[PDB]
Design a protein around this ligand. Structure first.
Ligand SMILES: COCCCOc1cc(C(=O)N(C[C@@H]2CNC[C@H]2NS(=O)(=O)Cc2ccccc2)C(C)C)ccc1OC
Ligand SMILES: *[C@@H]1O[C@H](CO)[C@@H](O)[C@H](O)[C@H]1NC(C)=O
Length: 336
């Protein structure tokens, strides 16, 4: 069922690495800062039942079911193994408020939340925007429950991620897209298979030559990822070409050599998506005496999904993204 409604969630841009919005859980609503992540399909927030021995839980907002009159017990164990770090807890049900839309949703109450990386997290939890096929415990994803209400104008959602600042950090439109944040026309690429927000990539070029992904590869379009990532192998070739040196968790260049770095292109569908050094270098200074990080890192995503590249916030900043559930495709337009 299709309605005549669109709803928007305003996002906060933290250091160009974390983009988060607000949701309410329970009656009265308990508010959480959440990441709207297309790379995952579960909703989870830290729990009141999380041991204060986890420092992450001392530093984030915790859901207390004893304060909610709309809470429905479940308790089924849940383990979400993200390749950045794992979280575990149990399933609960309550009413979630996201941009005006009120939905009864099953989510995880996280009781084990490691300091790495959650002590670095500005957000409390995650709202998975992926498909039921990738949902742990086969829990219905929040967008599937919102679609079911037959209130949205279109069975689509859009992401706008701004460059850091009094300005808008970003925006998610549920049921459509905001033309004030894109220009030109959307160019769609169909998903390889339903269940994942992954598309086919025809090549990655450094300068003017297809130095990588020559025989074709995969591209996961991931709103919950900070960077553009590829396999350890691909990133090694890429960096060697850039003149960038490998540190423990990132790659750097001397700050003075940042503006001089070549364009990086991504052949997706019938279009070339180009990022300049201004789009992928954290130009903190122009000093020959300082190191500057890149918004590209290695990440070996396991099968079935991987090995794959991941187009995170680095990519979405340049290109406004529309996720079309009705036609199993992703649209891109130049962000305004
Ligand atoms: C841009 O703003 C977003 C916030 C950026 O900050 C953080 C992000 C994360 C992070 O990595 N998360 C999960 C990943 C995003 N997508 C799915 C998942 N990928 S994964 O599991 O690592 C590979 C994979 C993909 C698909 C299938 C299988 C395996 C979050 C959302 C829990 C952790 C700490 C962060 O802050 C210190
Ligand atoms: C938890 O929710 C699922 C939803 O299908 C249900 O099958 C399961 O029995 C529930 N468990 C409890 C204890 O309510």
């Amino acid at each position: 069922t299709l309605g005549n409604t669109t709803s928007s969630v305003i996002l906060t841009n933290y250091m160009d690495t974390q983009y988060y919005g607000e949701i309410g859980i329970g009656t009265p609503p308990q508010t959480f800062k959440v990441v709207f992540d297309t790379g995952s399909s579960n909703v989870w927030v830290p729990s009141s039942k999380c041991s204060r021995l986890y420092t992450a839980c001392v530093y984030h907002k915790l859901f207390d079911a004893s304060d909610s009159s709309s809470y429905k017990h479940n308790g089924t164990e849940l383990t979400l193994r993200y390749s950045t770090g794992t979280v575990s807890g149990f399933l609960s049900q309550d009413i979630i408020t996201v941009g005006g839309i009120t939905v009864t949703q099953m989510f995880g109450e996280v009781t084990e939340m490691p300091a790495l990386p959650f002590m670095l997290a500005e957000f409390d939890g995650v709202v998975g925007m992926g498909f039921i096929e990738q949902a742990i415990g086969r829990v219905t994803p929040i967008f599937d429950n919102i679609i079911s209400q037959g209130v949205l104008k279109e069975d689509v959602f859009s992401f706008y991620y701004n460059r850091d600042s009094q300005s808008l950090g970003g925006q998610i439109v549920l049921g459509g897209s905001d033309p004030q944040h894109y220009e030109g026309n959307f160019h769609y690429i169909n998903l390889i298979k339903t269940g994942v927000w992954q598309i086919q990539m025809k090549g990655v070029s450094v300068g003017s030559s297809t130095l990588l992904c020559e025989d074709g590869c995969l591209a996961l379009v991931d709103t919950g990822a900070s960077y553009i990532s590829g396999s350890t192998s691909s990133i090694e070739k890429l960096m060697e070409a850039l003149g960038a040196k490998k540190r423990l968790f990132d790659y750097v260049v001397k700050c003075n050599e940042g503006p001089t770095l070549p364009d990086i292109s991504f052949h997706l569908g019938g279009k070339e998506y180009t990022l300049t050094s201004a789009d992928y270098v954290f130009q903190e200074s122009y000093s020959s005496k300082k190191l500057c990080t890149l918004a590209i890192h290695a990440m070996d995503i396991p099968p079935p999904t991987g090995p794959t590249w991941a187009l995170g916030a680095t990519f979405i900043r340049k290109f406004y993204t529309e996720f079309d559930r009705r036609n199993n495709r992703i649209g891109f337009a130049l962000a305004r």
